Amino acid sequence: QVQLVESGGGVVPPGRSLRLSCATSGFTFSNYGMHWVRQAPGKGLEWVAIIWYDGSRNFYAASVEGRFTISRDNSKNTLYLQMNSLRVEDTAVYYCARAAYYDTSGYGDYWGQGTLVTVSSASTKGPSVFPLAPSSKSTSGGTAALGCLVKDYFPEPVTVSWNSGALTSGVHTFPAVLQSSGLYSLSSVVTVPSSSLGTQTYICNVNHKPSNTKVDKKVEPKS
Amino acid sequence: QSVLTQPPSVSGAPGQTVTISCTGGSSNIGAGYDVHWYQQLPGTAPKLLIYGNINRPSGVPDRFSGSKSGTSASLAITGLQAEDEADYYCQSYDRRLSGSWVFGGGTKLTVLGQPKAAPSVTLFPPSSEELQANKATLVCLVSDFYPGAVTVAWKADGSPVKVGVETTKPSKQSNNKYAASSYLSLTPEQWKSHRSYSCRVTHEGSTVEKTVAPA
């Protein structure tokens, strides 16, 4: 049975190089052209490159032209992708796909499982914590929502508690976003009674062990 | 944006029929280049679903069918099964590009296992503390929605904004509904240079728009 298996993925900084491999089996490798397709995390598919069955032609997407080089070793039934001058936007899972054709265009009839490539210049970094002043525009009657914005930290995770763990009901700590900058950001919001804002103090306790940073941010009512 | 336009999400109940469109132009689908479809289950690689516009691989059930007319192609799925939940991509060739293939943006298919749930939206403006740090982040938090598919669009005085937008993928909450977050990073000058900013959240054809004013 047709089988494609990618390998060589990893985590490197921008400017570094990398070589992906795709070992095949279950068919005459030398009779088929081969494709490389990639998919950024949570995004769509993007065609990368093709190589003719006989290695006579190579075509690339504009976003990689001049940096990536596709090749094949028919003796080992293996496809390769040499990636040079890696950029951060090259981060994606890379798929091996066998070329097929119909009448007026081609398609891929068999695919590999994929290999992950992560290009990041991110290093240990503590968060910037900002208060989200209470607002009742979107809460139930007699309550208000306040929170803390934990911005631009790396790597995961960060823990967020409220009033040293004494406040747990109504807390919703949202999963973090991995920004294009390579840094994470999340928000933690708590719903509290509006009548308690003039007295009860609310403090979010943020702890980012990777950087050994701890922040206790007091969230006060607005003007 | 993708050369071929697909809807970001479609949903249907078990046993129903759904259709997914793939709109192109005079340089790809309109020029007669064959269209093909792929199915990508969660956490797996794509698999061929339709080839040559209308042909099923022998391993694909007969509930999946494809067609095309003019500059558009369509994928139809009858008798929806929970196993059909996946992302679906169309694919063809475009005469203007240097590549062999061109993909659509993809469509997330949800098979309803529970009643639809509309999202709750909370919009926070930049705090005066962050602005004193010479920064500005708008926070739009979306929670308690199902299907787990949402579109977040930012506006500045009603005009679209794309630069500086960071939006998460929906993640299943503890109650089997989904939450998501979107951040618009601006400079204090940009925040002050407009009269209003808006977070517009679209879900299953309904829209919730919250707006804040720098004053």
Binding site: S30, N31, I50, Y53, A100 | -
Partner: peptide, 11 residues
């Protein structure tokens, strides 16, 4: 031409 059949045989 990147849209030409890249294989040794038809399908």
């Amino acid at each position: 031409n990147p849209n030409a059949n890249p294989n040794a045989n038809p399908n």
